[PDB]
Write a protein that binds this ligand. Structure first.
Ligand code: MN
Ligand code: MN
Ligand code: MN
Ligand code: MN
Ligand code: MN
Ligand code: MN
Ligand code: MN
Ligand code: MN
Ligand code: MN
Ligand code: MN
Ligand code: MN
Ligand code: MN
Lengths: 301, 292, 301, 295, 295, 292
């Protein structure tokens, strides 16, 4: 059975739209109603699934494959309307909350970053205020707009504001541009969020940044949220707000190794907009990030 | 001055964001919040402008010598809220009509046409309509999706912006009682083939007569081969030359507004969809001059 | 549930990899081992599924939707090796034969045209020598090659040779170029096949060609095999051997209306190679062709 | 011997950079210095060659193949500078003239349409004032100006002005979009609209009447077909001909006395699926066949 | 007011086709007549403008925005003929000189690199022989020849030869692939290899030492970065710099006395996801910021 | 003569389909019958040739002045039968070596390297190997898939074409006992990062020494950002400059053959994969000159 054969699921996982008893459920969130610039992330889950067949959940020299250590399934997608932002967020919250009643955690494949507010609400409900590892070119702590409460530049502001996040245990890495509009990092920093700009990441290195994550997060339940635009546009052209001067794929993949030293309770990989991609490299990278997160969940638990 | 030089305006027209005294104002509506399938029409005005430099408003055997046109830039449409975006479009388009005769709106998804109909009916009363589309776009609204792109002509008829007895829609195919029951004349792609351009033009003239008419073109009326850059393509469509030839009949009508919607440039190839959209717009501007 | 949401099946049909009791099973054949020029048809089923969500099986003014008249399902794909032509053909034959033990018919989404030999073998086994309506820019009655018994230019030669086809009840429409290599139509014509070149089709028109199909086929069980390259490259750029000067999409779709006047017992839509496509228009057309065939099956039965 | 194997030559013809004694030499002209809008036709020959391996010079029910009737070769390209329009046009004429000293005729693969003036100069030197069949969305009879003598909208104005063309034996077909000079000189202009009325057959009859048996040069701008069929071109014009219409119309060439031809304005950067270059190959293939039929 | 709305200007700056009294005018130069390989840079300004709406002139932790420190405007484009290299270069110089009569400086968005000779001519007229920071995979100090005086490999040879540049204050960085003239004139060449050894910091130190406080022109060929980061360019050269390296290196400009700059060779037809044009915008944005910082 | 002019040969070299007396012959292997995922490498030689005109064999601070090279065209490889295609490649490559010193094979999928190894070992005995790849390609063959693209180095070791104690493979990542058990040195992408270019080059020199060495480059060794046009991309790969810098060490070795495989142009963007492949080939040719 060649890897491109059969209806595409994430990493060729079994499909079950009403999953019960799994460790990690992969759930798509095909929605881009929060996008402020280029849309198209509504196709992110479809494209990521299509390209994911390539990727095995077996590493190099890591012993047993992820899927022999933990039980995972592709639960299909949340039925998110493209016509109403507030309804989509509520729907996502309800669906994600549902998944946690009989499954340990989910990996949400987006979809624009606004959806993370729904995920944080679901996860925080089960675990209390959460530590956060956030990889992004943008802080995403901007204020809501008239008529846009949940644009894709707001999710971590809502997370802090609603106490879904313990900002003293939040680290965001890769920051180098403004999303929707210029807004200082004063809100984040004043709340105690540790911001690691792309510049600082260059100084710290993968190792130093990983140490910083372990120190800030400790063993608190942690949600790891990855905006694909964290990496340079060369590595992830298929995204709605590219920001030149970003991380290399290998830096992001190496950094995520530290997740297995934490207590991850949820994760997401957002903002893949496949129409802007080239050779599917963005969706392939998104898959690999997802795979690494799953493996690290296994290692951690 | 090569045609690609300078900041791109529609057909290299002058730009004036607050125009007054023009015959037709070209106005972009960069918004795709009504799209049900592929988004990207928010970039339609930019792409159309970018490709439009190629196109002269001089045919074979000059528009901008006959009438006064200008590119009024865009309506600032939020991508986050369909209700606010439609209201904003309505306000802006209505404002344009207070000071100028008519507009050509470059979309943007077809939902925006309700705003256009509202503005135009405010000036001319209930309107005749010539609607070119693969889809009827007379589907019901529902709570949470009041202005999806399949509703504009339903809203138009419901709100009495359209006189359905003077509305013809051409090109419908793929995958109608409401429309027909209201008196709308539907010309499927199949029927269009039987009637031909000339028979369809005769039908339009018969149905619309001299009534103030809004001509609304969904780029998806033509086969996906001619317009790949669109959100809901429908195979088995009209040839570009058929649509362009058909639109010559507009000069025999009394056009009071027009639009060219649903160009989604990310799906285009070689810019051909945006070039065709420009040519459609150009034809409409010329026919406005001929009519008036 | 927006049409791009959920794991993609053909026209959003239910999925069942072991279907029993359906009227028409949609089965993918992700294989391009028979391609002589550009490969990539192995991705045809995936791409066709992905773009098919757009298309409803409800026509305009046709009353009840296809799926309210007949029971259809997406059976997933045949696991076709990309490394061995003869094994792939045998595997396809066996799988397709299996489907007919508990289901009335299938719609095979290819995959290169070589696979049709397997389909003809399965269908002929159930119904005896078959009438054939073949839409293609190429006759596909070329001889096998050293090391290539089942290249994509051979299927109708094998069908005639093995008596899977009643050539006196076979019509091929759209012929205008040579595939793999130049070969006269003498073999086909000498066997009594009616060849309607693209030129002749222009003279006959859709209506005249449909009359010709009804006359030649009658009420014999008929297999309808569509090579996407029948239409001009403008309408189907995503294919392995384009041939300029082809039919319009609407001509092909109109012609296929005559299928409901026949006794169809199987069909396929082959040679979509999505890497060469633009805006997905080829896969969208392939979907619509499939939809029309399904509707016509319903009408006929 | 798969069609995509080997270094790409036009229709897998043999290559000879200094051909002598052939019937028709296929010569590339990789230059876009005359382009007024999108450039990229400099890559036309390369892309056409690459996609051409698909296409056999054997038709359906047409008998022996073209290459069994006439001896053809791919002569490579003319070394045309991208930096100087006047030098490129001069170089083109010299090279084309050279080919005609040793071979009966050439099929030039462009490259932008300005190059056709060089071809006309070379061909008229051998045959005298020429009849012309010109397929294009644009008339290409616009005036030259200082600094742009050879923009791509000039070749037929030069041809007429220099008496390389007998305008009373020139027909241009497909004109549309956005003509006194041409008409006043006796050129028959068939707009796309008029072509729709006349049909392929009526237009072919018209061509035969206008050209007669005068030596004729057939020049095809790929932009004559609708952008749907030829997206890869520099100045697309919506509302154009179908591929099948152009190919069928070109059958009339075998009833004429063709002495040269070209296929211009393919700009592969704007193409999709290589369909423009595949069509250009098929047009060239039809022209070669009709050359064999005529002679 | 979404970033993709309105007619596209560079970074959504106001437009004024006859700007007077500004600090820095952004001027497009839509011309690729100097290109030796792939054309298409004529569309550079249009594509850069279209993608630039994304990018704010506000940095991270950098304080007040660029446009709050300096007054900038998009001056539209120079009307450059695609048909004549010499006329285009002359036109460019005239237009750029005009801008300098009424505005402090300009940022030119190309267009192929040959245009830089016109910019250098205009800028040196105001400031005398210039220091130069040149980022490129290629030295662009190749000789001119008759018929191609201004191909895109010549601008810095002209600049040195005409004494528009003080070569003892010129540094070129990124050179690689496939130099006596430049070195013999005192130019400091930093190959991509040497850049790897020196690092961003070492190279910046070198620039500061070489340029000092002499008026300096900063010219960036987008092909300095690896093709992975800038695929949309005419002569890509594998093995190039990372985007982040170029952006970080350009921080040193605020320690200098910049009097002009440009960002050349974007050819959008070869771009993917618009990433080249987005990067070009960010480079321009950094140059404007460093101009404000310097002054 | 502009670099895009003339029929495309590798780096504008002369063409001779039956060469004799050359130092290195460039030979295309247009075949993708071993691909397990995306096909299209059958077009690798054509695309590489098309883009290669850009690249001069003159570095900074001239190859074709040092050694004599030629483009020998392609091997006529059937797309329909893997066993016949491998045998054909072997025969053709062996024929080239009877009359010329070495070849640079431009692929084509990596399965073809078994044929190359067979031909080269016939001239030099069991070979040292430097293999750059995201994948080890030492997977087992099976009936019906004897020469899939994940087998070439397994066949090489099994058939004694390779001395595994003198084989190093660099770049392995993603998703090895056979190889390690045979003495192969595997340098994962992670280890490569620790060692750097210089440490890896030292390791290669130590392992291979002066033994006749075949250098086989899978384009997928570099990150998909640098080489999108390939059949099995693996994120987190090497930068182009790292691969090019590493290959400088070949000039300190005794190279007897090389290849650049798995370019699949349909997935490329801006031709960057084919341009990189050309530069890799160019570097290898220069290092051949330096070594010999
Ligand atoms: Mn972001
Ligand atoms: Mn984000
Ligand atoms: Mn529609
Ligand atoms: Mn519509
Ligand atoms: Mn076919
Ligand atoms: Mn076929
Ligand atoms: Mn033309
Ligand atoms: Mn022309
Ligand atoms: Mn350069
Ligand atoms: Mn340069
Ligand atoms: Mn590999
Ligand atoms: Mn490999």
């Amino acid at each position: 059975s060649p890897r491109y054969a059969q209806i595409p699921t994430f990493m060729r996982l079994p499909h079950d739209p009403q999953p019960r008893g799994y460790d990690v459920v992969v759930i798509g969130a095909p929605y881009d109603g929060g996008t402020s610039y280029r849309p198209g992330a509504r196709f992110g889950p479809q494209a990521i699934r299509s390209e994911s067949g390539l990727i095995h959940g077996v590493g190099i020299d890591r012993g047993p494959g992820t899927f022999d250590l933990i039980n995972c399934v592709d639960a299909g997608d949340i039925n998110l309307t493209p016509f109403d932002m507030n309804i989509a967020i509520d729907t996502a919250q309800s669906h994600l909350s549902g998944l946690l009643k009989a499954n340990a955690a989910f990996l949400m494949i987006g979809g624009d970053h606004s959806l993370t507010v729904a995920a944080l609400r679901a996860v925080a409900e089960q675990h209390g205020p959460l530590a956060v590892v956030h990889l992004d070119a943008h802080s995403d702590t901007n204020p809501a707009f008239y008529g846009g409460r949940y644009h894709h530049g707001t999710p971590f502001r809502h997370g802090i504001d609603e106490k879904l996040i313990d900002p003293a245990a939040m680290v965001q890495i890769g920051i180098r541009g403004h999303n929707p509009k210029p807004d200082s990092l004063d809100y984040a920093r004043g709340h105690g969020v540790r911001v690691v700009t792309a510049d600082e990441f260059g100084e710290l290195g993968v190792g130093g940044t990983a140490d910083l994550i372990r120190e800030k997060v400790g063993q608190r339940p942690v949600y790891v949220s990855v905006d694909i635009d964290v990496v340079d546009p060369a590595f992830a052209p298929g995204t709605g707000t590219p920001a030149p001067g970003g991380l290399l794929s290998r830096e992001v993949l190496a950094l995520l190794r530290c997740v297995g030293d934490l207590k991850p309770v949820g994760f997401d990989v957002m903002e893949v907009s496949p129409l802007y991609d080239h050779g599917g490299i963005t969706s392939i990278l998104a898959t690999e990030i997802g795979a690494e997160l799953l493996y690290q969940y296994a290692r951690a638990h």
